[PDB]
Write a protein that binds this ligand. Structure first.
Ligand code: PMR
Ligand code: PMR
Ligand code: SF4
Ligand code: SF4
Lengths: 419, 414, 419, 415
C-alpha cells in the first residue's frame, strides 16, 4: 500500500485508450465497472474532441457479478462490432477486471468475430499510462503489420503520436514539414490518424521516426525485427537535436540534408543582447524522459542556462536519463512522488522550473517562475493555436515559452522595487 | 396537465456513462472540515479523484488514495495489518483531523477487504482523538452523489442520543445556502435545527425518538433508512429548487412544527417576491423550449419539475440513475404528466431515443457533452448543479441562469 | 502645455523611421539634435534587428547653430548617399528642427543627387507617430509609383505593413497564405521588405490589400486615384472579418472564395462546453482603431463576451470607431490620456481588459485579467514563434491569448478559495 | 609601460549615437526622494523618457514632461502664465514634493524660455514648503550622464553656507554602495561626511571655504565648478572602481585628513584582499582579451583602467563624450600607454576603425549593440554601468562579472 495524492501517470488501460482514441475505425472494449468511463472526459474535455472515444465498457455492478461478468464482456464486444462495424478491435482488462477469472482471449475467440480482436495484457498494479500505450500499440502493430515490398518513393512511418499526448498534433505536423523539405514523405502516421488498414501497410515505408519512445519504442523495435526498418534514435526537440536528427535521417537514407531555416528565429533571439541576462540562470527540469533530456540540451547548449536538477517520473526511461544527467554532472532524480520533486527543487533552489502541471503548482507555492515542458498537463496546454515542441517552429515556441515567466533586463536592476 | 405519480418508469441497465461514488469526496471534503477521506483502491481511483478535483488537488486537500500493490492483492490477513500502518503514519502527521473515512472502491470490494471491520478496529486503536468510519463509494455500488448517501449513513449509527425534538436538514449544501435555510427556519420560529453533515465533527446533530428530519437533496435514500432506524421521522417535501420548491419545502416544516398561517406568509412573501422576479429575467429564452436529461445525480426529477413549472419548459425524457419511490413522491406529483421517466440507463439506446426526440436542451455528462455539441444539440453539463449553490430562494435566479446560459450562447454565436 | 507621463504614440518622425526601417535600399535623413538617435533602440531592442536602421541625423548642437544648422543637414545627406548608395532617399524634420528656418526641400535640391530625395511634411506639434508613418509612405509612393500594364496573372499589393508594427511580420505571412489558396499571388509588399524600385512597380497589381489604415490609408487612396486600383476596406482580424474580406476580394476580382479551413480551430474551441463560462463576460477594449474594431467583433459575435467599453488613441480612426461602438450600444472613448482610460475602466467595472502595454499595467494595478491587442507594446510582443493576429491562424492565436488570463470553470465555482 | 597623460586625444565630431542629458532623470529621481523632474520639451522628450524608464513609467514616477502644444509656439503665447498654471496643478496633487527641477530641452532652448528665471518666480510663489530649480538636459547641451552634472550644479549655489571642514562625496550613488563608502570613511576616522545629492531635500550638505569634496563619478565638471566657486577644495583621485581604484580613492581622502598609515591598512587589508579574490573569479575569461569602448557616459577611461590593470585586458581605442583633463589626470596616468583616446565621435568613421581593429570585446550603446553582434563582435552594453552597483570594494567582483558575462555567453553558446 502506497499513500497517494498526485499521480503523474494513469492506469495502463487509460494508455490503451490513448492509442484507441488516436485511431479511426478501431473499437477498444474494456472490461471494467460502472464509473471507469470517467476516463472518457479526458478526451472530450482536455483534448476537447468532437466525438465519443471509441471505448466501451462491460459495465459490471454488484447485482451482476459472478458468471455475468463473463456474459457482459461478450455483449459489449458484440454491440461494439454490430454498431460501429470497425476494421479491427482491441480487448483489455481494467484494474478491477484483473481480479476476476474472465479470460479476455477465450471469450473473444468463442465469439469468432469477422474482424481481428487483439487481446492486451495490462498489469495494472505494476505498470502505468505509458506502458499501457506503448504496449497497446505494439500488440496492434504485431497483429496487423506484415512484410512488404518497398515504396518507389522514399517514405517513412511516424511512430508514437497518440491522443492526449503533449503537443502531439503539431509535432506531427512540423516533423512532416522537415521531411518534405528533404524530399521524404510520411507513409503512415501511427497511432494518431491511422486505421487498422493503415497499420497493415506499415511494412512498405523505408524507415521509421520514433517520435516518442515512451509510447512507440516497442513498435519501433518490432518493425526492426520484422521488416528491416531502422528507426530514428534522436527526438527532434531543439535546434541542435533537429540538426542531429536530419544528419541521422541522412545516413539512414543516403539523402542530402536540405533544410529551410528562414523562419528559425530562436538562435538570434537568444544570441541577441536582450538575452545576455539569461546566462547563469539555475534551472530545474522535470517531466518524462524524452522532454527532459531534450530540454536540458536546449537549456545548457542553446539558451545558456545552468541545469541544477534533472528528473522524470517514468522508470522505463531511467537509464537514458541517468546517462544524460551524468553529462551535466547531476544525479538524475527518478521518482513519481511530487513531494520528492518538491523536496529536490527546494534543495537545489532554481531560478526557473521547467516541468509538468504539478511542477508549475509547486512553483506557484514557492513563488518561482515556471513553464511547462511535458505531460501531464491541463486544458490550456492543448491550445487552438499552432504550438509544436519539435523542429524549428518548436524551437521558437520553446524560446518564447521559457523566457516568458521571468523578469527581463531592466527592473531587476522591479515594479515592486519601484512601487 | 400536471401529475406523474402513476407514470410507468422505464428501468434499464446496459452501457453506462456515470461517475462512481468516490467523486462525492471531491465536494464532501470541502464541507466536512476535520474529516479525511482515504480511498482504498487502485491507481485508477487515485486518478479519478485527481482529475475530478481539478486544481483542488494542489490545495493540499483532505483526501488521498491508499493505492494497492501486487503484494497487497493476495492474502487478506496481511492486507489488513499493512493498512493500519498506512493509517497510523497518515494520522500521526495530520493531528488536525478528528474524522477518518475509509472509503471503499471496486478493487477493495472485489478483494473482499472488510473495511467496515478495519474502521472498527482503528476507532478503538485511535480513540479518543480520532473516530474512523467506513463506507462504499465503488463503481459496483454507487452512482456519483450516492457517495454522499453512504457516507452520511455511515456516520448515523454512531451519532449522539437525545430526547430533544430537534430538526435535522440532511445533505451537505454550500455554506451560503446553509445560512439562508437556518435564518428562514429561525424566522419561522422553528429550532433547534442542525445540518447533517455539520461543518465540524464536534458540532454534529443528535438523533432520538423525537427528532424530525428533512432531506435537502433527493439522493439520500440509505441515510434515511439509517435515521429512521434510530427512530427519527422524515418530513416529506418537494425539493427546495425555485420559488415554488422552496416554499413547498418550507411549508412542510411549518406544518409539521405548527407555525401559523400569517406567520408563514409574513416571513415568506418578501423572499418569494424577489425570487420570482430573478426567474423572470430568464423565462425569455427558456419558455417553450424542450428539455431532456441524461441520468447522473438524481437531481433530474426535481430540477425538471422546476424547469417546467417556473421556466415554462416542455419536458421529454427525464432520466435518473436511481429513483427512490417514496422520497420522490412530492416532486413526481408536480411533474408535467407528459414526461417520460427512465431509471438507470442503456447508453446506446438512450442516445437513439435522444436523436429521435431532438430536444432543444440536453442535461448530460461531460464525456457525453462535447460529442453532442458537435452534432448540433445545445447542452448543459450536469455536474455543475452540485458545485454551484442552487437550493432555496436567492439562488433560484441563478439556478434558471445555469440553463439559460448555454442557449443564450448558441443564439449568440449565430 | 500638457503634463505628459505616458504617451501612446511617438512623434511623427519616428513614424517616418518606421517606414524607412521597413524598407531596403532607402536612407532617411532627419534634421535633428544629437540625442534623438535614442529612437534607434526601438528597432534594435524591441524588434531586435541585426542592423542599424537606415536612419541618420544631422546632429546639430550648442556649438553649431545658426547658419551651420543648414550646413549639417547637407553633409548628413551627402555622407548618407555617398556611403550606402541608396536607390532613393527621404529628408524630414524633428520637432526641434520644426522651429528652425531651414529648408529640407531647398537644401536637398541645391545638393542635386543622382537619386530621388523625397522631402516629408511632418507637423510635430499636432500629429503623431501614425500620421508620420502613413504620410512618409504616401510621400514615397506618390513620387515613385507610375501606372503600368496589369500583371498577366491576377496579383495584388499588401499596403501598410511597417517596422515595429504589432504583429506585422506574421500578419504578412498569414495574409499571403490565404491569398495564395485563392490563386492570388502578392506583387509588392510595402513598406515592409520593399526597396524603392519595388515601389516603382506598384502600378502593375490588380488591387491592393489595405492591411492597416493607420499606416496605409493614404497610399491606398493615391493608388486608387492614380493606378485605378481598388483597395480592400475590411481588415481580416477574426473569422467573420476574414470571411467578409475574402468575399470582398472575390467581388473586386471575380475569383471564387477558396478557404483552407483545416487548421481553423477557434470556432470549435469557442463552441465547446469548456467555453460556456465565457458567455456574458464584461470586456473593455482599447488600443488603436483597427484592432479595437476588430477585437470587439471577435469578443461579441465569436467568443460571446459582452463589450462594455470601446476606444482608441488615434483621432485618425475616430469615425470608423464611432460607427462600430454604436453597433454595440456604446459610445466610443477617444483619448490619448492614460488617466482617462483608467477612469473609463474603473467606471465600466469590466471582467477582462483587451488593450495595450499601458492597459496591461492598469489591469494589474486593478487586479484584472488582461491581454494585449495593439501597439504600443513591450519586447515580449515581438515574439520568436509564429504569432499572427490576422487570418485563420490569427483567430487561433487570439482565442488562445484572450482566455489565458482568466480563471477556469472548476476554480470559478470553488487557490486560496481552498487554501 | 603605463601612463597615457601624454597620449594625443582624438577630437572628433559628426553623426552621433548618444543619449541626451534628459535620461539622467531615470536614475537621478530614484535617489532624490522628494524631488520632481519636469522636463519642458516636446513629445519626443516624453517619448524618450517613456522608452528610457521602460517599466518604471508604470510606477507613478517623480518626473514628467510639460509638453509644448501648437498654441505655445505663438508670438503672443505666454511662457510665464502657461508654465505656472501647469506647475501649480502639479504641486496641488503632489504635496509630498519639496524640490522641483525644470529641465531644459532642445525645443525649450530654441524658443529660449527663460527657465532659470522661471525657477525664481516659482520659488517665490511656492516658498517655504517647496523650492524650484532650473538646469538643462537638452541634446544641444548634454550627453547622457552630463544631466546629473547640470542638475547637481544647479543646486550648489542654493546650498546652505557653513564654516565646517566636512567632506562631500559627490555622485548619485546606489544606496547600498553609498552606505559602504560612508562606513569605510567612518572607520578611517574622517567625518562627518555627506553626499551630494542627499537622499532628501532637508539633509543636503552645506558648503564653505573649508569644505573638501571628492568625486565618485567622473562626469562632474560643472558641479566641480560651482563647488569650487563656493570655496570648497577638491580631492584628486582615480575613481573607486576595482580593488586598486577604490584603495587609491580612499588613500587620497586618508592623506587629505591625515590618517595614520597603520589605521588605513587595518581598515583596508580585510575587505581589500576579499575584493581582489572575488575578481580572480573572472580572470581566465578576461586576461589577454582586447577591449574597445564607444563614447557614452565618461565612465570609459576609469573602467578601461580597471579592465587593463586588474582584469588583464588590452586597451585599443577608448572613446569618451567629454574628456575633462584635470579630473581624469589620476586615471589617465594608470592607463596602458598604448591606448587610443577619443573625445567625441564621428559614428561612421569610428565604426570603420572598429572593424579594422576587430576587438574581442566592445562596450557600446543599445542602438549599436545588436547590429554589432550579427557582425560577429561580442558586445557589452554600457547603459548597465549607471544602473548597477559598481563602485567600491564589495561590488568589485560584480564589476568584472559584467564584462566576463557576454564573453562567457558567447563561448557556451557556440562551443
Ligand atoms: C531610449 C530607448 C530605450 C529603449 C527602447 C529601451 C529598451 C530596452 N531597455 Mg532600456 N531602453 C532604452 C533606453 C534606456 N534603457 C535604459 C535602461 C535599461 C536597463 C538598465 C535595462 C534596459 C533594458 C532594455 C531592454 C531589454 C528588455 C527589458 O529589460 O525589459 C529594452 C527592450 C534591459 C536589458 O536587458 O538591456 C539589454 C536592462 O537591463 N534598459 C536607460 C538608462 C536610463 C535608457 C536611456
Ligand atoms: C475525471 C474526469 C474529469 C475530467 C477529465 C474533467 C475535466 C474538466 N472539468 Mg471536471 N473533469 C472531470 C471530472 C469532474 N469534473 C468535476 C468538476 C468540474 C467543474 C465544476 C468544472 C469542471 C470543468 C472541467 C474542465 C474545464 C477546465 C476548468 O476547470 O476550467 C475540464 C478540462 C469546468 C468546465 O468548464 O466544465 C464545462 C467546470 O466548471 N469540472 C467533477 C465534480 C466532482 C468531476 C468528477
Ligand atoms: S471505485 Fe470503481 S469506478 Fe471508481 S475509480 Fe475505482 S475502480 Fe473505477
Ligand atoms: S535630444 Fe533634445 S529634442 Fe531629443 S528628446 Fe532630448 S531634449 Fe528632446
Amino acid at each position: 500500500m502506497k499513500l497517494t495524492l498526485w499521480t503523474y501517470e494513469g492506469p495502463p488501460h487509460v494508455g490503451a485508450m490513448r492509442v484507441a482514441t488516436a485511431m479511426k475505425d478501431l473499437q477498444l472494449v474494456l472490461h471494467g465497472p460502472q464509473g471507469d468511463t470517467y476516463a472518457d472526459l479526458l478526451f472530450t474535455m482536455i483534448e476537447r474532441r468532437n466525438a465519443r472515444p471509441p471505448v466501451s465498457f462491460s459495465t459490471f455492478e454488484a447485482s451482476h457479478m459472478g458468471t455475468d461478468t463473463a456474459i457482459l464482456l461478450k455483449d459489449a464486444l458484440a454491440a461494439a462490432h454490430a454498431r460501429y462495424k470497425p476494421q479491427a478491435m482491441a480487448v483489455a482488462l481494467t484494474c478491477t477486471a484483473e481480479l476476476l477469472q474472465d479470460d479476455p482471449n477465450g471469450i473473444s475467440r468463442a465469439l469468432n468475430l469477422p474482424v481481428p480482436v487483439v487481446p492486451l495484457e495490462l498489469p495494472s498494479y505494476s505498470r502505468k499510462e505509458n506502458y499501457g500505450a506503448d504496449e497497446t500499440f505494439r500488440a496492434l502493430v504485431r497483429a496487423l503489420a506484415v512484410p512488404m515490398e518497398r515504396t518507389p518513393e522514399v517514405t517513412c512511418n511516424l511512430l508514437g503520436a497518440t491522443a492526449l499526448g503533449f503537443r502531439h498534433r503539431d509535432d506531427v505536423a512540423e516533423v512532416t514539414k522537415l521531411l518534405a523539405t528533404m524530399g521524404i514523405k510520411v507513409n503512415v502516421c501511427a497511432p494518431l490518424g491511422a486505421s487498422p488498414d493503415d497499420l497493415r501497410k506499415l511494412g512498405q515505408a523505408h524507415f521509421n521516426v520514433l517520435m516518442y519512445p515512451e509510447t512507440g519504442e516497442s513498435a519501433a523495435r518490432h518493425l526492426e525485427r520484422a521488416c528491416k526498418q531502422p528507426f530514428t534514435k534522436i527526438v527532434p526537440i531543439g535546434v541542435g537535436a533537429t540538426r542531429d536528427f536530419l544528419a541521422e535521417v541522412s545516413k539512414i537514407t543516403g539523402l542530402p540534408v536540405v533544410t529551410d531555416e528562414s523562419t528559425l528565429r530562436q538562435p538570434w533571439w537568444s544570441a541577441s543582447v536582450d538575452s545576455t541576462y539569461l546566462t547563469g540562470k539555475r534551472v530545474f527540469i522535470f517531466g518524462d524522459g524524452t522532454h527532459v533530456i531534450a530540454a536540458a540540451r536546449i537549456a545548457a547548449k542553446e539558451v545558456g542556462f545552468e541545469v541544477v536538477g534533472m528528473g522524470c517520473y517514468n522508470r522505463e526511461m531511467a537509464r537514458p536519463l541517468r546517462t544524460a544527467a551524468a553529462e551535466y554532472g547531476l544525479e538524475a532524480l527518478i521518482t513519481d512522488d511530487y513531494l520528492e520533486v518538491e523536496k529536490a527543487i527546494e534543495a537545489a533552489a532554481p531560478e526557473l522550473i521547467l516541468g509538468t502541471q504539478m511542477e508549475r503548482n509547486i512553483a506557484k507555492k514557492l513563488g518561482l517562475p515556471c513553464a511547462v515542458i511535458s505531460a501531464p498537463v491541463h486544458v490550456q496546454d492543448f491550445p487552438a493555436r499552432y504550438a509544436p515542441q519539435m523542429g524549428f517552429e518548436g524551437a521558437n515556441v520553446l524560446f518564447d515559452t521559457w523566457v516568458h515567466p521571468l523578469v527581463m533586463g531592466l527592473e531587476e536592476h522591479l515594479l515592486t522595487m519601484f512601487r | 396537465t400536471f401529475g406523474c405519480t402513476d407514470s410507468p418508469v422505464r428501468r434499464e441497465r446496459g452501457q453506462k456513462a456515470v461517475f462512481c461514488g468516490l467523486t462525492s469526496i471531491v465536494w464532501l471534503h470541502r464541507k466536512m472540515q476535520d474529516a479525511f477521506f482515504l480511498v482504498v483502491g487502485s491507481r485508477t481511483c487515485a486518478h479519478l479523484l485527481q482529475a475530478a478535483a481539478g486544481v483542488m488537488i494542489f490545495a493540499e486537500p483532505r483526501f488521498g488514495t491508499a493505492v494497492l500493490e501486487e503484494q497487497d492483492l493476495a492474502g487478506l490477513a496481511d492486507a489488513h495489518k499493512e493498512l493500519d500502518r498506512e493509517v497510523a503514519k497518515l494520522l500521526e502527521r495530520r493531528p488536525d483531523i478528528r474524522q477518518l473515512f475509509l472509503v471503499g472502491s471496486c478493487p477493495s470490494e472485489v478483494l473482499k477487504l472488510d473495511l467496515d471491520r478495519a474502521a472498527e478496529r482503528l476507532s478503538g486503536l485511535h480513540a479518543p482523538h480520532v473516530r474512523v468510519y467506513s463506507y462504499t463509494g465503488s463503481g459496483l455500488d454507487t452512482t456519483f452523489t450516492q457517495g454522499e448517501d453512504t457516507c452520511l449513513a455511515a456516520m448515523v449509527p454512531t451519532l449522539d442520543t437525545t430526547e430533544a425534538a430537534e430538526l435535522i436538514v440532511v445533505g451537505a449544501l454550500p455554506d451560503v445556502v446553509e445560512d439562508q435555510c437556518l435564518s428562514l427556519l429561525t424566522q419561522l420560529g422553528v429550532g433547534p435545527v442542525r445540518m447533517l453533515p455539520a461543518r465540524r465533527s464536534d458540532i454534529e446533530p443528535a438523533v432520538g425518538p423525537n427528532t424530525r428530519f428533512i432531506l435537502a437533496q433527493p439522493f439520500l435514500g440509505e441515510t434515511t433508512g439509517a435515521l429512521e432506524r434510530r427512530g427519527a421521522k422524515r418530513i416529506a417535501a418537494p425539493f427546495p429548487f425555485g420559488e415554488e420548491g422552496t416554499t413547498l419545502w418550507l411549508k412542510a416544516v411549518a406544518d409539521a412544527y405548527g407555525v401559523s398561517a400569517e406567520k408563514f406568509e409574513a416571513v415568506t412573501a418578501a423572499p418569494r417576491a424577489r425570487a420570482k422576479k430573478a426567474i423572470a429575467a430568464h423565462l425569455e429564452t427558456l419558455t417553450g423550449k424542450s428539455l431532456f436529461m441524461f441520468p447522473d445525480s438524481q437531481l433530474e426529477i426535481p430540477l425538471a419539475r422546476f424547469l417546467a413549472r417556473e421556466c415554462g419548459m416542455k419536458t421529454t425524457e427525464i432520466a435518473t440513475p436511481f429513483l427512490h419511490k417514496a422520497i420522490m413522491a412530492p416532486d413526481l406529483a408536480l411533474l408535467p404528466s407528459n414526461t417520460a421517466l427512465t431509471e438507470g440507463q442503456d447508453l446506446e439506446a438512450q442516445l437513439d431515443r435522444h436523436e429521435a426526440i431532438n430536444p432543444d436542451l440536453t442535461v448530460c455528462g461531460l464525456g457525453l457533452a462535447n460529442p453532442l455539441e458537435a452534432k448540433g444539440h445545445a447542452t448543459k453539463w450536469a455536474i455543475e448543479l452540485v458545485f454551484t449553490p442552487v437550493h432555496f430562494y436567492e439562488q433560484a435566479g441563478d439556478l434558471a441562469g445555469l440553463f439559460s446560459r448555454p442557449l443564450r450562447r448558441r443564439a449568440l454565436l449565430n
